[PDB]
Amino acid sequence: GQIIKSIAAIRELHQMCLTSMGPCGRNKIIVNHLGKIIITNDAATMLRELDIVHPAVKVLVMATEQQKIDMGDGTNLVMILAGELLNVSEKLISMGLSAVEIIQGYNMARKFTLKELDEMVVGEITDKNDKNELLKMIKPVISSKKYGSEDILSELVSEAVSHVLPVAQQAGEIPYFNVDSIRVVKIMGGSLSNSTVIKGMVFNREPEGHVKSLSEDKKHKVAVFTCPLDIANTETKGTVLLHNAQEMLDFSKGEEKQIDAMMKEIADMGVECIVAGAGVGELALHYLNRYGILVLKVPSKFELRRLCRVCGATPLPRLGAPTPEELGLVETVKTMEIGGDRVTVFKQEQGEISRTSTIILRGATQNNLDDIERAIDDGVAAVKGLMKPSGGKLLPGAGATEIELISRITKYGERTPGLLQLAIKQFAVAFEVVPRTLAETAGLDVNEVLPNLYAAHNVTEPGAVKTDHLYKGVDIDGESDEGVKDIREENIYDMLATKKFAINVATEAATTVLSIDQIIMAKK
Template identity: 30%
Template sequence: MNFGRQTPTIVVLKEGTDTSQGKGQTISNINACLAIQDTIRPTLGPLGSDILIVGGNGETTISNDGATILKLLDVVHPAARILVDISRSQDAEVGDGTTSVTVLAGELLKEIKGLVEEGVSTNTIIKGYRYAARLATEKIKSIAVKVDKSNPEELRDLLERCAATAMSSKIIYKNSAFFTKMVVDAVLTLDQNDLNDKLIGMKKVPGGSIEDSLFVSGVAFKKTFAYAGFEQQPKSFKSPKILCLNVELELKAEKDNAEVRVEEVSEYQAVVDAEWQIILSKLEACKDSGASIVLSKLPIGDLATQYFADRNIFCAGRVSSDDMNRTLQAVGGILHSTTSDIKPENLGTCDFFEERQVGSERYNFFTGCPKTKTCTLVLRGGSEQFIAEVERSLHDAIMIVKRAVKNNIVVAGGGACEMEISKYLREVSRSIAGKQQLLVAAFARALEVIPRQLCENAGFDGTDILNKLRMQHAKGEQWAGVDFISESTANNFDKFVWEPALVKLNAINSATEAACLILSVDETVKNEESGGGQGPPPGAMRGGMGVPR
């Protein structure tokens, strides 16, 4: 009892703070995610459309890669940003399936939107979805086919099939036969223990046709800034010694370096002579090392350029860190931070060095490297946007091949795997009592969005093909999927439409976790004016139980 005393009003949140909670907030979050799904679903599959995105500075990007599109879209809704995050994580972890994971997460939310509106507890839904995801994961592992890695021909065939499937939805699918060999060669060049894809360099040179692209088993980089005397240097060597430096070989003006007070001209001349002596001793050390090629991450000035030209030595300064690291991986040797005590065993070598014209650019090529654990793809094409999309397409294919090397279990693509899991979950749901039956069945229906969307994007009759697929899978044809050539269904495993099982496993688990996370939020606190550490962060979200799930 308060005996007539009034409880004072307590202000907890800063003025202007917007709070919304309960079932309405959960539905709002689901609708935001469905808007993201509607934006990206037309890009799914071999016949999906591209999206043209114009940035704030007028820069245009044309792509059908899910991770790229979502990264460029300025998504501000905090719940919808979760879909952006899972697309990025799929791209980082697997490299492909970025559109599929976003579409699947949206469909999982769409299937249970009605249940949320009817008042079913989100905790019950989360429990059902996690159970269904666990069943789906076990099913994928049980039906996946393992390929023998000990047979080089069989392994290469597997990698080429996976690369071709990854390219089927990309802009380069008509040239997939050309690029498949290039991608597999690139991955097999790497050290098979760590498979560091950053050692695969990609250089873009506008002009020429797409099949003018080059695979370089070694290193290629664009000719760096050159001083006078550069054209007098030799442009090709056989079995050269290569010296890699992190040393500046350039004279600096005295006024830029330090203040020197002198009383006589001879003293000033002594300072100048000392500077010249320092740089000449560095150049002499480079020549005495026996190197035919000198590369440096720092500038090599006009004096050094002319000095090397007079002695038939090739030099390149301002070589980027990435190019220098890949060069060291290919030719061997070490990066020197001083020119004193250069030992012959610390120099690199290759069979052949050449500077030659590629389109409108000059490129330096190091080939026949004894320690080659790196390679370079020189991409050609008609426009910069086109080449940029080719680069993104090849990145996805390289990541898929990389995963296939590490995990040599594959499943059929074209919606075959999703339909088989959907059939399995429907059968399991009939043996479960209570609300969980509805939730496992909802998960099964959501998986069908992949083959349905593939059909819709291709202009096929989605309902008719989906009915055929359900019938075939019910008869035990577990690899039946959408066939884009016959506009019907086919055994996609026999047609070599293969994908690493890791793509499906990661997509289903990521989509389920995203859906569960969004369902666990029942309150959003938003303060547009917050700053300086005061008040809650903009778009802060709270879990239904007030604790992290």
């Protein structure tokens, strides 16, 4: 009976994810062997920091990463649903129903569910990219992660998305929004109300010079130099040495005349900003302060890629050749104090619209500061789901989708004759774990809220056409309430691309586990 114990091993990790999804969820502190503490509420990220023993668990871990890479949302829906499909199948495996027909039953039930998802769409997203329209999609993403910040973070995330998107409609050929267009930075001090939205990357380091900021002139030229600042020498070796004191005056003054001659040609071309990816010498910073050139050093090659998409600058393999064709243009750059420390940021005004933005976060709690950093990244992938593959369609969330599927699947159970009725009925019952998890973690009685959920989606209406309220979902309460509430009040919806993709992954995940009747292992 290893197939039963294999589910029990997953059951130990099943309750771990049951404490994640929902507003009652919480991050888990993990101490790495290198002495580094990673804290995040997302369960998919936690799986990478956990040591997996049984190889059957890795099947669900590999299926969990499928949800994060493509859609990026619904990782908790894939792991929790796949764990429940094994529990409802444990009764079928024991009852004497072969696991072969159990797999065949899920394949027939999966095709019946995918056809019903198109008829469950209530509203449709027009892809207007309006600040108020993005508040409907972002609110449920921030929900079930961090409580109380859903109102403040909704305006910060939706504002940065509208900055990187151009003005277009009814065009899906050329993609626009990427996953790197939104960067998350953090600084000690302040609160969430004082946070703002920047139209470009934010640099928290020092300018390393007596020039704090440039002027207000339009279209500042920015040059990215990969070669460090120093006198030009032979690429092979070329170490400066002093044999006698006679060559000291020639080599010292030679570096002063050569560097000043190269910096003069750069300032004459109109370049007020020089980006040096490598180290900067001592004599180089002296000439840049007199010409009024801002000093910027970005050793990371990843940050230089997003900078080229904004102003249009290109890294030059040499030094002293400011080719105007490859130079970039930025409207306004300023150095302001945000969060208690003076930093030099990067933004724009009108022209040279930036394709990458950065949101500045402030707060007095260090633990909740890193949790919001991981929560915004989940909201970035939500905008990507607005593309052609069913980006506008949406389904009601907050447990309203999983409960409504029960009445439709059981209707097709008695329609299909044969032994498939056992797997079809258990496939709909497995969806009851989602409303039960939200009700159990919220302190609500199972004998109270659960029977009202079944009576909400199942009523007797004197007519053929459905009526009254089909929008009743699952409520977390937290203060007081009687029965349930309508989801249309808070406008919490789930996208079709996220829900439809999470069902196929969770179905194939449980299919692999049920198909394995034997596991061979070897000690290392």
